[PDB]
Design an enzyme around this catalytic site. Structure first.
Site, short mmCIF file in Angstrom:
data_model
loop_
_atom_site.label_atom_id
_atom_site.label_comp_id
_atom_site.label_asym_id
_atom_site.label_seq_id
_atom_site.Cartn_x
_atom_site.Cartn_y
_atom_site.Cartn_z
CE1 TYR A 1 1.11 -0.75 4.37
CE2 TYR A 1 0.49 1.65 4.16
CZ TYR A 1 1.29 0.68 4.96
OH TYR A 1 1.92 0.98 6.19
CG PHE B 1 3.72 9.34 0.95
CD1 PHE B 1 4.52 8.11 0.80
CD2 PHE B 1 2.62 9.41 0.00
CE1 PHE B 1 4.29 7.26 -0.09
CE2 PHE B 1 2.34 8.40 -0.74
CZ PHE B 1 3.44 7.60 -1.20
CG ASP B 2 3.28 4.03 5.83
OD1 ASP B 2 4.31 3.72 6.12
OD2 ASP B 2 2.24 3.44 6.02
CB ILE C 1 -8.56 2.39 10.13
CG1 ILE C 1 -7.87 2.40 8.80
CG2 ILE C 1 -7.60 3.20 11.03
CD1 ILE C 1 -7.92 3.48 8.04
CE1 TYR D 1 -4.62 5.04 13.29
CE2 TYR D 1 -5.00 6.12 10.93
CZ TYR D 1 -4.72 5.16 11.84
OH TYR D 1 -3.80 4.19 11.20
CG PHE E 1 -4.71 3.81 2.69
CD1 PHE E 1 -3.37 3.38 2.89
CD2 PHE E 1 -5.49 4.43 3.67
CE1 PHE E 1 -3.06 3.52 4.27
CE2 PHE E 1 -5.22 4.27 4.78
CZ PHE E 1 -3.90 4.21 5.26
C1 LIG Z 1 -9.49 3.34 16.44
O1 LIG Z 1 -8.16 3.84 16.28
C2 LIG Z 1 -7.19 2.88 15.74
C3 LIG Z 1 -7.55 1.84 14.73
C4 LIG Z 1 -6.63 1.08 14.30
C5 LIG Z 1 -5.28 1.21 14.63
C6 LIG Z 1 -4.03 0.45 14.08
C7 LIG Z 1 -3.17 1.20 13.01
C8 LIG Z 1 -2.88 0.43 11.66
O2 LIG Z 1 -2.73 1.11 10.61
C9 LIG Z 1 -3.52 1.36 9.38
O3 LIG Z 1 -4.72 0.96 9.98
C10 LIG Z 1 -3.29 1.76 8.17
C11 LIG Z 1 -3.67 0.80 7.38
C12 LIG Z 1 -2.88 -0.37 7.73
C13 LIG Z 1 -1.12 -0.01 7.61
C14 LIG Z 1 -0.81 1.67 7.91
N1 LIG Z 1 -1.91 2.40 8.21
C15 LIG Z 1 -1.80 3.62 8.45
O4 LIG Z 1 -2.60 4.34 8.70
C16 LIG Z 1 -0.46 4.29 8.44
C17 LIG Z 1 -0.74 5.68 8.23
C18 LIG Z 1 -1.45 6.06 6.93
C19 LIG Z 1 -0.88 7.42 6.19
C20 LIG Z 1 -0.66 8.14 7.08
C21 LIG Z 1 0.40 8.01 8.08
C22 LIG Z 1 0.75 6.57 8.18
C23 LIG Z 1 0.47 3.95 9.72
C24 LIG Z 1 1.55 3.69 9.62
C25 LIG Z 1 2.36 3.35 10.60
O5 LIG Z 1 3.59 2.64 10.53
C26 LIG Z 1 3.68 1.48 10.08
C27 LIG Z 1 1.87 3.52 12.13
C28 LIG Z 1 0.36 4.13 12.01
O6 LIG Z 1 -0.08 4.31 13.25
C29 LIG Z 1 -1.31 4.88 13.76
C30 LIG Z 1 -0.37 4.28 10.77
O7 LIG Z 1 2.37 3.21 13.00
C31 LIG Z 1 3.05 2.14 13.34
C32 LIG Z 1 2.00 0.89 13.33
O8 LIG Z 1 2.02 0.08 12.37
C33 LIG Z 1 0.70 -0.58 12.27
C34 LIG Z 1 0.77 -1.86 12.50
C35 LIG Z 1 -0.84 -2.31 12.50
C36 LIG Z 1 -1.75 -1.67 12.24
C37 LIG Z 1 -1.53 -0.36 11.89
C38 LIG Z 1 -0.50 0.17 12.09
C39 LIG Z 1 -4.86 2.21 15.60
C40 LIG Z 1 -5.80 3.06 16.24
O9 LIG Z 1 -5.59 3.70 17.26
C41 LIG Z 1 -4.22 4.38 17.27
#
Ligand SMILES: COc1ccc(CC[C@H]2OC(=O)[C@@H]3CCCCN3C(=O)[C@@H](C3CCCCC3)c3cc(OC)c(c(OC)c3)OCCOc3cccc2c3)cc1OC
Length: 126
Positions: free
Chosen positions: A44, A54-55, A74, A100, A117
């Protein structure tokens, strides 16, 4: 690109509140789409449409893996990837209520953040 989805994108929310809009950019194989609990393999690109982060999984030269429909990502991802075929690439524009929310996720995400995305579904396994 964020604005193209706003025009041509399919609303794939149950509510139908345009919270997750989706365009297919490349058509995948067959008809089969993943089921709850399936291990999902994707590349992605994601960004904060009005923002400066940007990731990409391509950065880390390995596919992002997760279990579908188990809260591990999410809402938009559980709803969006559920509709994708093996090898499909889709674009998603996502209102904050399906990401979020008003809290965002300091440090990386702010409050009220709209997300975009590009997702490629490589594989899924039950
Ligand atoms: C109800 O609130 C929540 C719902 C779900 C989550 C889990 C976060 C999850 O990330 C995601 O859902 C999405 C899609 C899956 C991969 C990365 N995701 C991201 O949103 C990235 C963002 C997307 C672009 C903006 C900056 C990075 C995104 C990338 C990130 O770096 C890899 C990131 C991140 O943390 C919020 C978001 O921080 C590190 C965590 O990496 C993960 C690992 C597993 C799942 C995810 C991220 C946390 C919530 O509260 C904090």
């Amino acid at each position: 690109a964020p604005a193209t989805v706003t025009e041509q994108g399919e609303d794939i929310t149950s509510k139908k509140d345009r919270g997750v809009l989706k365009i297919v950019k490349r058509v995948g194989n067959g008809e089969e789409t993943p089921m709850i609990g399936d291990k999902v393999y994707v590349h992605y690109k994601g960004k904060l449409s009005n923002g400066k982060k940007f990731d990409s999984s391509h950065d880390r030269n390995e596919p992002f893996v997760f279990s579908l429909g188990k809260g591990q990502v999410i809402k938009a991802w559980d709803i969006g990837v559920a509709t994708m075929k093996k090898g499909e690439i889709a674009h998603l524009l996502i209102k904050p209520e399906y990401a979020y929310g008003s809290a965002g996720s300091l440090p990386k995400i702010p409050s009220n953040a709209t997300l975009f995305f590009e997702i490629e579904l490589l594989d899924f396994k039950g």
